[PDB]
Amino acid sequence: IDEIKSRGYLLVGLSADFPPFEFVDENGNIVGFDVDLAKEIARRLGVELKIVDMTFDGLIPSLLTKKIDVIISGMTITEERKKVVAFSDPYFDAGQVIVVRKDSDFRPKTYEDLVGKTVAVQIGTTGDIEVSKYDGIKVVRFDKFTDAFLELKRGRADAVVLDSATARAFVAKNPDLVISSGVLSSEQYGIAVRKEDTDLLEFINSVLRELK
Numbered sequence: 001i002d003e004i005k006s007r008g009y010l011l012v013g014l015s016a017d018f019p020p021f022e023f024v025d026e027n028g029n030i031v032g033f034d035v036d037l038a039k040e041i042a043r044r045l046g047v048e049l050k051i052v053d054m055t056f057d058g059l060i061p062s063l064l065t066k067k068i069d070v071i072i073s074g075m076t077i078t079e080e081r082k083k084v085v086a087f088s089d090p091y092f093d094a095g096q097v098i099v100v101r102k103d104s105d106f107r108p109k110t111y112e113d114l115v116g117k118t119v120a121v122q123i124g125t126t127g128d129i130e131v132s133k134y135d136g137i138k139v140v141r142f143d144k145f146t147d148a149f150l151e152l153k154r155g156r157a158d159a160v161v162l163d164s165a166t167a168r169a170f171v172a173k174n175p176d177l178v179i180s181s182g183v184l185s186s187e188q189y190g191i192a193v194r195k196e197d198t199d200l201l202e203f204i205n206s207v208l209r210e211l212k
């Protein structure tokens with residue numbers, strides 16, 4: 001709080017490849033739900049918003065080393081992450097789905113249908129964590145969902161595992177892709193802050209409570 005207020009700018013870490021929460025528009029702005037949340041936290045602090053964009057798997061370590069104040073980046077509240085960092089009250093529900101090529105005959109519905117397929121994930125996500133739990137799935141890991149889909153679209157992967165909302169976002173803009181599966185997990189995004197910064201966390205929950 002008072003390091004942020006001193007410096008006049010709240011540093012947000014995210015990965016701008018995840019509509020409709022964080023993505024790059026036609027003008028090269030990071031826009032969408034998570035950015036608006038950030039704007040409304042910064043606005044309430046009287047500081048300005050500095051968006052730091054980086055790969056997803058860079059967020060926790062960035063935050064643990066003070067390069068950022070918060071992670072607002074469609075980040076699922078996991079017990080495993082809850083061990084190193086602290087989370088806000090939940091701000092959105094989502095779950096893993098499987099996106100395939102609408103061409104293909106292949107319509108997986110469960111993770112077991114992906115066994116002996118090549119599956120594209122974003123390193124360090126809950127999709128990555130979860131497909132990695134089934135043997136036989138040949139998991140190929142990408143820094144960016146952009147390149148995970150590119151590769152599906154080429155033919156070099158049989159599917160992409162990611163959150164429901166973003167899947168819908170990516171599918172709306174690639175009519176050669178379809179979501180084959182229903183929702184395969186039950187996740188809730190939170191806003192990640194260091195465990196010491198409890199007066200920041202409480203502020204975020206006050207703002208979060210005030211928006212809803």
Ligand SMILES: NC(=[NH2+])NCCC[C@H](N)C(=O)O
Nearest residue numbers: 015018073074075076125126
């Ligand atoms: N680039 C992103 N914003 N990815 C969101 C990650 C998806 C999921 N909520 C997770 O925490 O692993």
